[PDB]
Design a protein around this ligand. Structure first.
Ligand SMILES: Nc1ncnc2c1ncn2[C@@H]1O[C@H](CSCC[C@H](N)C(=O)O)[C@@H](O)[C@H]1O
Ligand code: NA
Lengths: 265, 265
């Protein structure tokens, strides 16, 4: 009669909380999805070994179209867990799944875990300063989406930072690199001409948040657009005007260029 | 030899990540601060038991003025951990502590944990739609803070949701309730008369996120301002423009008035 939405955390199998693990171990059935994000520092096998339960993976269609006939039926007579990377309900559509549970007479509880939304705090950028967030999508066919560029413009205009998620093809396991993200934004700038993203724009790249050795880099596009940030996934941030302490942290921790202490503060 | 910034999570000792627990267990010295937030479902005793180490609690003064005198010295010859509620670098000034560590020749690592910043997901509000965040502070003497009101105005203007961290006076055991926050806001509205926060404003309250049964309520200020939302900690959220599914979740899960199902596009 109970469904537990349990977050898996940022990087590897140890990013799940003690509460989430203990609850997952007591569940009769455990489902998981890895289409919204992928746990780059571990594997399904390692996660299954830690939880000590067989994990049935669900595709996007399984969830969005058939959550009520795949997961909920079992949650009516047993304790069921639904595992997701990061913090449950961060993914836009996930919250609605609790409404489906209700309508099916199934109770649901949420067990939180670290999310990139809060983990980006490791860049030294003040969390309260983040504005609306967005996702950089690949252009294709006759479709060139550029809304993420407008998001950056509006936030920046108000001195706010912009958290940018990069495109991902979970199934195909193909990621968009921060490098590719920068190339696309430069292309959009050439069309929009809004002076929002140029070779002189200061950006921050975060890779493998959650690991003991994440990659945190900050600098100007002209210098970072060809740098090697390691294996995906990458997160790109376009910070608004920086608080002095933010710039110093980037300089001291992320090896940012001295220049930003005077140019972007 | 090294310093660990380890987050403890939202509610109780089990909100720490497996990674954080296993590392905390093998540290020679463990320090902690419990003034940046309230973990209403645990005690120092329970935390010490889980980690199996004695924890020396530091005050805001100990940290902000003497971190390099109390913590760092030991990190030069031992493995030290500094524990904090939620995520160590979120809505705190702890990021700056890493600079002190570096300048002292001490390498540091960060172990994230569930944070209120991402936990807002349980409100059903799309996380990407939150804009600049703010803190509602207790007026002090003739000083009556009001900046948070302008933040709400800026966000609502963009149709973005506003997350409001609430004040805390740890040494006085004082934790601002959502009720007190709304009262202060109504008073600021009377002074500024910007039509930003009135009795008809839709607000969302999230109390004791992280527990298995947090209080999640949504509705008009006039109806919520005197409602008992349970023990602290609380956060107040003032949504911007709602998507259909957001409104639906507020009604179905947060008990909002069914008329809120209708949205003014
Ligand atoms: N579990 C919880 N439930 C509701 N509000 C919470 C909360 N934890 C923190 N808060 C809010 O956040 C404020 C502290 S700011 C510190 C946040 C912490 N670093 C984190 O990552 O979560 C509290 O005063 C309250 O306003
Ligand atoms: Na945000």
């Amino acid at each position: 009669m109970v469904l537990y939405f349990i977050g898996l955390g940022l990087y590897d199998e140890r990013d799940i909380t003690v509460k989430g693990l203990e609850i997952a171990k007591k569940c009769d059935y455990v489902f998981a999805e890895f289409y919204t994000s992928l746990m780059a520092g571990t594997t399904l096998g390692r996660i299954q070994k830690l939880i000590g339960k067989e994990i049935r993976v669900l595709s996007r269609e399984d969830v969005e179209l058939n959550f009520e006939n795949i997961v909920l039926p079992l949650a009516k007579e047993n304790d069921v867990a639904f595992l997701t990377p990061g913090d449950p309900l961060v993914a836009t559509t996930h919250a609605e799944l609790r409404i489906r549970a209700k309508r099916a007479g199934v109770e649901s509880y949420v067990i939180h875990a670290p999310s990139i939304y809060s983990a980006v705090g490791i860049t030294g950028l003040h969390i309260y300063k983040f504005g609306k967030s967005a996702t950089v999508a690949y252009p294709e066919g006759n479709w060139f989406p550029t809304s993420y560029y407008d998001v950056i413009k509006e936030n920046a205009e108000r001195g706010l930072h912009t958290l940018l998620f990069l495109d991902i093809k979970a199934e195909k396991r193909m990621y968009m690199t921060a490098n590719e993200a920068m190339e696309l934004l430069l292309k959009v700038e050439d069309m929009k001409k809004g002076g929002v993203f140029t070779d002189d724009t200061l950006v921050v790249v975060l890779a493998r948040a959650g690991s003991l050795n994440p990659t945190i880099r900050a600098g100007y596009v002209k210098d970072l657009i060809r740098e090697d940030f390691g294996d995906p996934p990458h997160i790109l941030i376009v910070p608004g005007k920086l608080h002095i302490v933010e710039a110093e942290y980037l300089v001291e921790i992320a090896g940012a260029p001295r220049e930003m202490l005077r140019v972007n503060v």
